[PDB]
Amino acid sequence: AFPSRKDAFRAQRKGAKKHRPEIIVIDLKDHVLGRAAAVVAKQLLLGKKITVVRCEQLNIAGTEIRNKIKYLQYLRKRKLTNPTKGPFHHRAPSDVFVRTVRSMLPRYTKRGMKALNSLVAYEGIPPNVVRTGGRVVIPRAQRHVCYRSERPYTVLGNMCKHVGWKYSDVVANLEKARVEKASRHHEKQAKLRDAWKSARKEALAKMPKHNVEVLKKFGYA
Amino acid sequence: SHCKFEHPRHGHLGFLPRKRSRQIRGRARAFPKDDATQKPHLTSFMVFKAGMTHIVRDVDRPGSKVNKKEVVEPVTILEAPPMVIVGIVGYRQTPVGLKTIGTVWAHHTSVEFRRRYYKNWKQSAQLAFSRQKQFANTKEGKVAEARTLNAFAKKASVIRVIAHTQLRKLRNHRVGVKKAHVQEIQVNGGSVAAKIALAKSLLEKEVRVDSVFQQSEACDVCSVTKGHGTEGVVKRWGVACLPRKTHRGLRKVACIGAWHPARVMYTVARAGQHGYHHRTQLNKKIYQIGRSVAVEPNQATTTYDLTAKTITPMGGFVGYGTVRNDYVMLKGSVSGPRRRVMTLRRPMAPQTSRQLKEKIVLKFIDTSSKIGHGRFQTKKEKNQWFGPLKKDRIRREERLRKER
RNA sequence: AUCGAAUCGCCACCUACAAGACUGGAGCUUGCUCCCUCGAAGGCGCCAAGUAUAUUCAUGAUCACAAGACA
RNA sequence: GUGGGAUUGUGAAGGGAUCUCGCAGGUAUCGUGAGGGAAGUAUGGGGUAGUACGAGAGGAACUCCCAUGCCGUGCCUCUAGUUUCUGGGGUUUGUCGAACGGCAAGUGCCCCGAAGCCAUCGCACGGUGGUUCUCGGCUGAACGCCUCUAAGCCAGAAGCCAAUCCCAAGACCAGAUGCCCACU
RNA sequence: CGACGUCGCUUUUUGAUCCUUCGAUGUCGGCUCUUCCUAACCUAGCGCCGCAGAAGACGCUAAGGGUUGGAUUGUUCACCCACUGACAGGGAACGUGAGCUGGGUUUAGACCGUCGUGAGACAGGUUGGUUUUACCCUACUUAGCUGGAAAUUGCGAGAAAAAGAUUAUCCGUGCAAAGCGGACGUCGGGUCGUUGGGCCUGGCGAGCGGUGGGUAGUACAUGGUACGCUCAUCACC
RNA sequence: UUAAUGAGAUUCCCUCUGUCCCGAGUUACUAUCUAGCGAAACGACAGUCAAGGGAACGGACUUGAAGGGCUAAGCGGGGA
RNA sequence: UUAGGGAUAUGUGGCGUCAAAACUUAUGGGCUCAUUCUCGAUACGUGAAAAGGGUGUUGGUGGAUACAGUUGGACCAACCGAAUCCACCGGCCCCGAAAAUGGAUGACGCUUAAGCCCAAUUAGUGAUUGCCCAUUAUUCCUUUGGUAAGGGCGGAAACAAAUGGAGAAAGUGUAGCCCUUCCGAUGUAGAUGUGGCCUGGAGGUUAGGACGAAGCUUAUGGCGUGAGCCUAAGAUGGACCGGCCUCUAGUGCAGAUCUUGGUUGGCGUAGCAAAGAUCUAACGGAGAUAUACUCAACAUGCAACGUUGGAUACUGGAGCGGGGAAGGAUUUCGUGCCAACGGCACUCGUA
RNA sequence: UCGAACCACCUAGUAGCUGGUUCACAUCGAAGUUUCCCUCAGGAUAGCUGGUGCUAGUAGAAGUAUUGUGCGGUAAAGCAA
RNA sequence: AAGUUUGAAAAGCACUUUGGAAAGAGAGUGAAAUAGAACCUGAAGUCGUGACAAAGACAAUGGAAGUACCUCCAUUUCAACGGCCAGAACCAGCCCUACUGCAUUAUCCUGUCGGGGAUCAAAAUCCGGCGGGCAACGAAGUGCAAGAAUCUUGGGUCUUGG
Ligand SMILES: C#CCOc1ccc(C[C@H]2NC[C@H](O)[C@H]2OC(C)=O)cc1
Ligand SMILES: [K+]
Ligand SMILES: [K+]
Ligand SMILES: [K+]
Ligand SMILES: [K+]
Ligand SMILES: [K+]
Ligand SMILES: [K+]
Ligand SMILES: [K+]
Ligand SMILES: [K+]
Ligand SMILES: [Mg+2]
Ligand SMILES: [Mg+2]
Ligand SMILES: [Mg+2]
Ligand SMILES: [Mg+2]
Ligand SMILES: [Mg+2]
Ligand SMILES: [Mg+2]
Ligand SMILES: [Mg+2]
Ligand SMILES: [Mg+2]
Ligand SMILES: [Mg+2]
Ligand SMILES: [Mg+2]
Ligand SMILES: [Mg+2]
Ligand SMILES: [Mg+2]
Ligand SMILES: [Mg+2]
Ligand SMILES: [Mg+2]
Ligand SMILES: [Mg+2]
Ligand SMILES: [Mg+2]
Ligand SMILES: [Mg+2]
Ligand SMILES: [Mg+2]
Ligand SMILES: [Mg+2]
Ligand SMILES: [Mg+2]
Ligand SMILES: [Mg+2]
Ligand SMILES: [Mg+2]
Ligand SMILES: [Mg+2]
Ligand SMILES: [Mg+2]
Ligand SMILES: [Mg+2]
Ligand SMILES: [Mg+2]
Ligand SMILES: [Mg+2]
Ligand SMILES: [Mg+2]
Ligand SMILES: [Mg+2]
Ligand SMILES: [Mg+2]
Ligand SMILES: [Mg+2]
Ligand SMILES: [Mg+2]
Ligand SMILES: [Mg+2]
Ligand SMILES: [Mg+2]
Ligand SMILES: [Mg+2]
Ligand SMILES: [Mg+2]
Ligand SMILES: [Mg+2]
Ligand SMILES: [Mg+2]
Ligand SMILES: [Mg+2]
Ligand SMILES: [Mg+2]
Ligand SMILES: [Mg+2]
Ligand SMILES: [Mg+2]
Ligand SMILES: [Mg+2]
Ligand SMILES: [Mg+2]
Ligand SMILES: [Mg+2]
Ligand SMILES: [Mg+2]
Ligand SMILES: [Mg+2]
Ligand SMILES: [Mg+2]
Ligand SMILES: [Mg+2]
Ligand SMILES: [Mg+2]
Ligand SMILES: [Mg+2]
Numbered sequence A: 001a002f003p004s005r006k007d008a009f010r011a012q013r014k015g016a017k018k019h020r021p022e023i024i025v026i027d028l029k030d031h032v033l034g035r036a037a038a039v040v041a042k043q044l045l046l047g048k049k050i051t052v053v054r055c056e057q058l059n060i061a062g063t064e065i066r067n068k069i070k071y072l073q074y075l076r077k078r079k080l081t082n083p084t085k086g087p088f089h090h091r092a093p094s095d096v097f098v099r100t101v102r103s104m105l106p107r108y109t110k111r112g113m114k115a116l117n118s119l120v121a122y123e124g125i126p127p128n129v130v131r132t133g134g135r136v137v138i139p140r141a142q143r144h145v146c147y148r149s150e151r152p153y154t155v156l157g158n159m160c161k162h163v164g165w166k167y168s169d170v171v172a173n174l175e176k177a178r179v180e181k182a183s184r185h186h187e188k189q190a191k192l193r194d195a196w197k198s199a200r201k202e203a204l205a206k207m208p209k210h211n212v213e214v215l216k217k218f219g220y221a
Numbered sequence B: 001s002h003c004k005f006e007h008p009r010h011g012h013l014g015f016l017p018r019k020r021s022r023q024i025r026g027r028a029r030a031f032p033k034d035d036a037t038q039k040p041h042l043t044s045f046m047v048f049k050a051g052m053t054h055i056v057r058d059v060d061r062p063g064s065k066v067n068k069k070e071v072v073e074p075v076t077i078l079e080a081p082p083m084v085i086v087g088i089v090g091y092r093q094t095p096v097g098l099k100t101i102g103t104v105w106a107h108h109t110s111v112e113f114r115r116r117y118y119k120n121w122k123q124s125a126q127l128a129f130s131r132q133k134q135f136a137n138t139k140e141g142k143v144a145e146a147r148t149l150n151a152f153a154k155k156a157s158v159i160r161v162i163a164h165t166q167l168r169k170l171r172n173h174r175v176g177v178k179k180a181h182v183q184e185i186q187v188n189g190g191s192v193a194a195k196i197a198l199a200k201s202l203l204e205k206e207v208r209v210d211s212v213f214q215q216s217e218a219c220d221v222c223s224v225t226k227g228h229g230t231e232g233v234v235k236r237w238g239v240a241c242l243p244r245k246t247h248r249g250l251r252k253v254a255c256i257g258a259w260h261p262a263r264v265m266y267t268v269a270r271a272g273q274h275g276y277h278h279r280t281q282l283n284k285k286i287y288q289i290g291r292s293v294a295v296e297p298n299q300a301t302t303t304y305d306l307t308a309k310t311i312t313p314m315g316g317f318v319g320y321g322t323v324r325n326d327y328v329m330l331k332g333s334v335s336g337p338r339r340r341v342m343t344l345r346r347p348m349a350p351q352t353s354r355q356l357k358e359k360i361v362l363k364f365i366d367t368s369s370k371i372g373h374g375r376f377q378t379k380k381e382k383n384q385w386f387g388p389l390k391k392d393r394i395r396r397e398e399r400l401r402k403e404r
Numbered sequence C: 001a002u003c004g005a006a007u008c009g010c011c012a013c014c015u016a017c018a019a020g021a022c023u024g025g026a027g028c029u030u031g032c033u034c035c036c037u038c039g040a041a042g043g044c045g046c047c048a049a050g051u052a053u054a055u056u057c058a059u060g061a062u063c064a065c066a067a068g069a070c071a
Numbered sequence D: 001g002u003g004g005g006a007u008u009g010u011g012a013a014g015g016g017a018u019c020u021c022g023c024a025g026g027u028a029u030c031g032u033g034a035g036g037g038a039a040g041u042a043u044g045g046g047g048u049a050g051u052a053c054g055a056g057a058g059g060a061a062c063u064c065c066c067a068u069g070c071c072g073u074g075c076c077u078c079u080a081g082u083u084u085c086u087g088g089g090g091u092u093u094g095u096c097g098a099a100c101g102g103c104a105a106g107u108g109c110c111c112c113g114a115a116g117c118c119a120u121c122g123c124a125c126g127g128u129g130g131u132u133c134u135c136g137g138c139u140g141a142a143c144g145c146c147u148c149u150a151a152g153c154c155a156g157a158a159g160c161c162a163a164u165c166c167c168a169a170g171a172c173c174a175g176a177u178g179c180c181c182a183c184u
Numbered sequence E: 001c002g003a004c005g006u007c008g009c010u011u012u013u014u015g016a017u018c019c020u021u022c023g024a025u026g027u028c029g030g031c032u033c034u035u036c037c038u039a040a041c042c043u044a045g046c047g048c049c050g051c052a053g054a055a056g057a058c059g060c061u062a063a064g065g066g067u068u069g070g071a072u073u074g075u076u077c078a079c080c081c082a083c084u085g086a087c088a089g090g091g092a093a094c095g096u097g098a099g100c101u102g103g104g105u106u107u108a109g110a111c112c113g114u115c116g117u118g119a120g121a122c123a124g125g126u127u128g129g130u131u132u133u134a135c136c137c138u139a140c141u142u143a144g145c146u147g148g149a150a151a152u153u154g155c156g157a158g159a160a161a162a163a164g165a166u167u168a169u170c171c172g173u174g175c176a177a178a179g180c181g182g183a184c185g186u187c188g189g190g191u192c193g194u195u196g197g198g199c200c201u202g203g204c205g206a207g208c209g210g211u212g213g214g215u216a217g218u219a220c221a222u223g224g225u226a227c228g229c230u231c232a233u234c235a236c237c
Numbered sequence F: 001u002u003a004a005u006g007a008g009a010u011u012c013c014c015u016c017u018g019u020c021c022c023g024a025g026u027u028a029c030u031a032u033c034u035a036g037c038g039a040a041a042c043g044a045c046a047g048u049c050a051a052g053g054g055a056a057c058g059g060a061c062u063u064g065a066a067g068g069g070c071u072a073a074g075c076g077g078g079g080a
Numbered sequence G: 001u002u003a004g005g006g007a008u009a010u011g012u013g014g015c016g017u018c019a020a021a022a023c024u025u026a027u028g029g030g031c032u033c034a035u036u037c038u039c040g041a042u043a044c045g046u047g048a049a050a051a052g053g054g055u056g057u058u059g060g061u062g063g064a065u066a067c068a069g070u071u072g073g074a075c076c077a078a079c080c081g082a083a084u085c086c087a088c089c090g091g092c093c094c095c096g097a098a099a100a101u102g103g104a105u106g107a108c109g110c111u112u113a114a115g116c117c118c119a120a121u122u123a124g125u126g127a128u129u130g131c132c133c134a135u136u137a138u139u140c141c142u143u144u145g146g147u148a149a150g151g152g153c154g155g156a157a158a159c160a161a162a163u164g165g166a167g168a169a170a171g172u173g174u175a176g177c178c179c180u181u182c183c184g185a186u187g188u189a190g191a192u193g194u195g196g197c198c199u200g201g202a203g204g205u206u207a208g209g210a211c212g213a214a215g216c217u218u219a220u221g222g223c224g225u226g227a228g229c230c231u232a233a234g235a236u237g238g239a240c241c242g243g244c245c246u247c248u249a250g251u252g253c254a255g256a257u258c259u260u261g262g263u264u265g266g267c268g269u270a271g272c273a274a275a276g277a278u279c280u281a282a283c284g285g286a287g288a289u290a291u292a293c294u295c296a297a298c299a300u301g302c303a304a305c306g307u308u309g310g311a312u313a314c315u316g317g318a319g320c321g322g323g324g325a326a327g328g329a330u331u332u333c334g335u336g337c338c339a340a341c342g343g344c345a346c347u348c349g350u351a
Numbered sequence H: 001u002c003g004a005a006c007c008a009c010c011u012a013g014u015a016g017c018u019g020g021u022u023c024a025c026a027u028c029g030a031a032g033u034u035u036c037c038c039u040c041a042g043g044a045u046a047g048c049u050g051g052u053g054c055u056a057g058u059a060g061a062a063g064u065a066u067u068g069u070g071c072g073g074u075a076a077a078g079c080a081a
Numbered sequence I: 001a002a003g004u005u006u007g008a009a010a011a012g013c014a015c016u017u018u019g020g021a022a023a024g025a026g027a028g029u030g031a032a033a034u035a036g037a038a039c040c041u042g043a044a045g046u047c048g049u050g051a052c053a054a055a056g057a058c059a060a061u062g063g064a065a066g067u068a069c070c071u072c073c074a075u076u077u078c079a080a081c082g083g084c085c086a087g088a089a090c091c092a093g094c095c096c097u098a099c100u101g102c103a104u105u106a107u108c109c110u111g112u113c114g115g116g117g118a119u120c121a122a123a124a125u126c127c128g129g130c131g132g133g134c135a136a137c138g139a140a141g142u143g144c145a146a147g148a149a150u151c152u153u154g155g156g157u158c159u160u161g162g
């Protein structure tokens, strides 16, 4: 994680600038857990670097009690002779998603671990990801197109909090502060947004006339 | 087939692995729950175990057979020289646990605190904190300290102070260690701004045990037990001894597992390290918070026993020496041997019981010799029994005649 | 400083939020009518700093990892 | 680039080439806590009370208070056990001429015996919130009435989960710090 | 609770079979020790009763915890004495013999009864009758060293970080505001590339400081640090 | 039937005790570390588990769960 | 259902990921909600289930009533203004449904299914092959063998080098006389064939070797489907030996608790623990006081021997005392010596 | 060394039983059934298989139909035969 | 059990140096001491050393395809020359896709009359009578299709050979 002094020295000798790999950031809020994992697992195997946020807002079909009991049945499975080196049951919603993706990969091959190590999961949206670019969704894994709205569903964070996850309140407080800060920033920069809108509207009267007709033909004016 | 008769299993599976403790000092793994309505206060203190004795007091609890009657209670005496606050640390809450924000160091640190950073201090260059001292108090140094302090105000939910023991003030010949024991003490109570105010006011200052604990309160003890090295299953786990007829030995577990699973389970008693384990012990009632003998000599004097005695028994505490500092008298026993540094923590269990709420008044403190059936409480009592001895006559006769 | 590398979309307009049994706004008649920005585009970027009066490109010879890449 | 080595086996001393390796980290603290473990569990007495109930005979329980069994984690002030401190005394046979000092009897034997270790044979300590079962209910349709349910809610078990407690970063901590060095 | 019938479950009984093992998988019982199951004896709740109370019956959720000391018998079972809240039933190669023990069973010696002409026989009785080996690999218990995120390589660049001439071109304060408050100078040189240019360096000062000299009171647990004043030195520079 | 006799088999009583309740402490020689010396048994290949099927009880096979490497002292679950 | 390969199509089974295919297809219709072995997705495989039951939801059949049925109001009839209720039979779901290490639609997971029944192939548009996987099918190339099928084989004629070529065998089998064509090709026990391979000798024939035979060594390559053959190199060796035809036999090795020799992990491990015991100085000995720099000595030559003098202890006369028989036969004695041996050591010794 | 010692020999005793059995490729390729046997862990004997062929290469062909012409007493049915 | 099988000849390693010695380092003999005395040749197995290759834990080994690096190996080529690599052309043969005609509808298509239906009133769904008929837009998703990929320059063949 933390760069070595040799790595920093080599970069300065090369004189290169800041580098960021092409990373897709997925907002997992109101996404079906299984369908999102299957889509993400295939993309990881195709060499994509994927970061998922708001894992605590994933959805599973059924009542919360039914899915809580499902996790508790998974929790009771452990190597009796030595619970260490036994099955490791992770309670955080981001680790639950990571485990779901891992079971959908060839995890016991080097290629499978290369795909798995290309995925980063978070609860909420941490500051290092907030300003990296627009977030994406998976339309075929979204709740409002996947579930019939009459059926009950569970939120992953609510299920995880009652089976051992201890940071439900921390994530909620951090997410509240993030949205207020983003809303305040978005309440500002409105003048900049409207200034460019009027600049595009006023520019129609300054460009050559035949260029306006071309824009109208292709539905841009 | 099922076991013929049932009995509870030997030992507690929650104290595993039965390995040597990572550190020799007692460290609180958790602190009492913070409540913002109280004034800021420290929650722990480091002490040294001197020895044991017993006291006499009246019992106040109604409804008991010992109500308004005297009882004899063993107590443990722990030397508590004052602690020095050398730093402030702040923690912010993250989804993966607390993270340290930064450290604000005091402008001056004691020599015995800097000795902790060396394996051979006397033969070293002794350059610890030399650049920090030069950087601090400068224009950039003062700004950096202010920025770190402001970060604590904005992002910290937990404020702790860095404290260390004073082995120069302890003045113990058998303790050996000259480098201070360093620990973090959480500041509970008040707002985060109020916690930083107290921590700043305590920088470079001494803190006494009586400002952290009160006489009749209870406290938790974090300490490491006495080590015994490799021990067998009989002593390590309390299993039964096999009959005298047994071939290849008696002090063993006969069956260490069934055929299936084809493994030895983690629940089977095996020989290994015994002792030297960290233990957090609950509800140790403070029976006395004593003052230094240089300040108040009559440490063991009570309102009922008017004999002028110190807390140190006749002939000294065995293997430890004299208690020369402030001390804490805890009811009962604590884990670990003499000379070992221990942490007293403010209690985390509820303290609403009648036993925990009782006000303790000591009537008699035993100061007889811990070496071989002490029968005198003071040296004067021994002199009155024997009177002048042969060696007293020789010493007096030489002084009376040769020198006069 | 070995080191020649694979990678080929930038942004200080997306990089805030929430709901799909109804989120542009009204009316009463409650599914129709009316108003509007008319409800199906994140903005740029693709060879003249801008749609015109223009201007070096070769022989790197007909493909070859773009023989180059801080947009 | 620079530093350090080497090459394939019939000689020697010199020149090239070609390979391999080093070129930024060390050292000392304070913490985080994922995951794993996981523990406290029972009885009696006082009081309620000779009360509720009952014709009578009989005859209860919770709050609270005080003890105790088992289990667990320690501790050595007291009491007990243990002595190769062969500590100090006795005492038998042999033995150095005797006394002294002792010595041998694989610790001669006897009594007492500190320190240390140690015994429910002694002493101390053993805690908090949730999610739910079963079930009892609220609101309420389907089905004009009705209904704990079917959409919603409440209450809630020694179960279960977390706190407390134990190990803890191969959980690879871009957690925080002290000194050098390297880069600059 | 449930006759006459009828439908199941289980593998803690026996039987049926003969798939595995006969160049060998150590046989009963007990002792010890751990774990698992629930068809629940006690302990936590909750229904119902031919439920007044007390004591109980039946049933549901629940295996977290507990489930004893003895006489006879090799016994498993059985039975009796006694304590208790209760003294529930079972699995784990009929758990467990390189863990023990060896009383039984089942060699060779010997006695009795019955049978056999006999040698001998008897799921009839009786007494006496060698219990071997771990230093290997795993497992488990403790105990050391030690690299490693491309899980040893790639130079293959992702921070639960900041927030801007593209993180450069200062520090606070504030809401990623509106604003607001601060900042050591001066005189030269050298050396590279659009504005009071970057970097290196020298002389005068000043300021914040680190050490030591001389001095005064005070603090703190009282030998040992801090603090005022004043010199010297070093650093930012 | 039988006195005496018996390393013969059995039952009870007194005494006595670590046989037991219930374990604790100590000693010599080991084990343990070192110097010198220095084997054997055994050895297809090897050596983490769950379930599944399978010659009906897998270290290898299927699907999952684990597993950084090398080591010292033990230990008797497995290696049918 | 199987010679060695390629391409194109399929079979069974599939198309959410693992895992190729609907990057979760349709502009197809319905049904299902299942709280601790955890709804279902199991042909064979019963390789998990019954009788019985459900006012769960969705369908049917046959009857009954319609100013109805339920309420409110006075055991019956009136207000009140809509469709009800009676029996029976299906579908899916649920209960019945309890076992021992933690675990299994294969795992994750799935509920606008990724479940069940049915039905399609880019969809009321305009016609009858969605897609993915074989040692199968079709087809192309090569091999090999046939109950194989045919052609050619009387050199057509012409043609030096320096500057079109080569071959053409009347043939079972070879480097196959050459060319064309068709079909088959797996296989335990077992049979047979092979101008099939290899080894020691013999009769022949033809060669090689001191300018290096046999043997041996190999990241030495080439040839053969193979058994194997051949070349290269030896910074290997030092005297014999290859090819071909025929003859001949003690003629080919991975295993027989195989035989003999050697080696080997275990392993510097188990251990070398009954008979109480040695200490000290000096002498002897190569066995030491054994040293780059720095450096007064310790922290850099350790540990071990024999003799003598002291010390301490043991045997304790049924003795590690002094003599004999049996047995042994030079072990006796002196000097010298330390390779092996005296399971450690020796400067000592029954060597 | 004893419910018949030891040494050499007959003796390489016999064994329907256990174990082993050394090169390649090619063309073909089974049976665990019949009868007899002191036969039931084994043999003979037919069958299945290989090799060698012989005979005028469609001949005396067929695990299949059709059409004629025979045979039958199981499924079903019946007990009012 | 054991070939004394060193070498043609003992010419069997004088002498120097370290070491108590055994021996080592040199120097000599010899064609050859790696021919140094149980001495020709000197295999396998096992082990040491230097160099290099890397490598988690999938016991290791193995199969098939590639790749990175090495190669004391073989062969070929080195002028308008190549037996090397690659791309486009054309041919022949295959394998694919595009472009469609014949037949058939009637339980059907229309108009009109009557009924019936539901509406504020209609219409329509529906049933009869009669009269016409080709539902003909890419009519139908109904039976069969033979349409020279030359016309009218489709695609592939690193799945063939030129
Ligand atoms: C008498 C009698 C009955 O009880 C037994 C007990 C043990 C055995 C031995 C067999 N057990 C499995 C294997 O077949 C054999 O293992 C071995 C070591 O031979 C047989 C019968
Ligand atoms: K936990
Ligand atoms: K647990
Ligand atoms: K780490
Ligand atoms: K057997
Ligand atoms: K109960
Ligand atoms: K008998
Ligand atoms: K051939
Ligand atoms: K051998
Ligand atoms: Mg929706
Ligand atoms: Mg039991
Ligand atoms: Mg038992
Ligand atoms: Mg048992
Ligand atoms: Mg015994
Ligand atoms: Mg024994
Ligand atoms: Mg004492
Ligand atoms: Mg003596
Ligand atoms: Mg005593
Ligand atoms: Mg049975
Ligand atoms: Mg059997
Ligand atoms: Mg055995
Ligand atoms: Mg066997
Ligand atoms: Mg066994
Ligand atoms: Mg139950
Ligand atoms: Mg229970
Ligand atoms: Mg239990
Ligand atoms: Mg058994
Ligand atoms: Mg059983
Ligand atoms: Mg045994
Ligand atoms: Mg046994
Ligand atoms: Mg056993
Ligand atoms: Mg017996
Ligand atoms: Mg008779
Ligand atoms: Mg017997
Ligand atoms: Mg007998
Ligand atoms: Mg006997
Ligand atoms: Mg790396
Ligand atoms: Mg297993
Ligand atoms: Mg074992
Ligand atoms: Mg053992
Ligand atoms: Mg083919
Ligand atoms: Mg294909
Ligand atoms: Mg796929
Ligand atoms: Mg779909
Ligand atoms: Mg099935
Ligand atoms: Mg299956
Ligand atoms: Mg079935
Ligand atoms: Mg049914
Ligand atoms: Mg129903
Ligand atoms: Mg139904
Ligand atoms: Mg129904
Ligand atoms: Mg499952
Ligand atoms: Mg299922
Ligand atoms: Mg499946
Ligand atoms: Mg062919
Ligand atoms: Mg001619
Ligand atoms: Mg021929
Ligand atoms: Mg064949
Ligand atoms: Mg021969
Ligand atoms: Mg010849």
Ligand SMILES: [Mg+2]
Residues within 6 Å of the ligand: G218
């Ligand atoms: Mg080689």
Ligand SMILES: [Mg+2]
Residues within 6 Å of the ligand: none
């Ligand atoms: Mg090799």
Ligand SMILES: [Mg+2]
Residues within 6 Å of the ligand: none
């Ligand atoms: Mg030959």
Ligand SMILES: [Mg+2]
Residues within 6 Å of the ligand: none
């Ligand atoms: Mg032979």
Ligand SMILES: [Mg+2]
Residues within 6 Å of the ligand: none
């Ligand atoms: Mg061989």
Ligand SMILES: [Mg+2]
Residues within 6 Å of the ligand: G257
């Ligand atoms: Mg063998």
Ligand SMILES: [Mg+2]
Residues within 6 Å of the ligand: G267
């Ligand atoms: Mg070895």
Ligand SMILES: [Mg+2]
Residues within 6 Å of the ligand: none
């Ligand atoms: Mg040893």
Ligand SMILES: [Mg+2]
Residues within 6 Å of the ligand: G273
């Ligand atoms: Mg021994």
Ligand SMILES: [Mg+2]
Residues within 6 Å of the ligand: none
């Ligand atoms: Mg001895």
Ligand SMILES: [Mg+2]
Residues within 6 Å of the ligand: none
């Ligand atoms: Mg001597």
Ligand SMILES: [Mg+2]
Residues within 6 Å of the ligand: none
């Ligand atoms: Mg020395």
Ligand SMILES: [Mg+2]
Residues within 6 Å of the ligand: none
């Ligand atoms: Mg010496």
Ligand SMILES: [Mg+2]
Residues within 6 Å of the ligand: none
């Ligand atoms: Mg003696």
Ligand SMILES: [Mg+2]
Residues within 6 Å of the ligand: none
């Ligand atoms: Mg004696």
Ligand SMILES: [Mg+2]
Residues within 6 Å of the ligand: G317
């Ligand atoms: Mg005598």
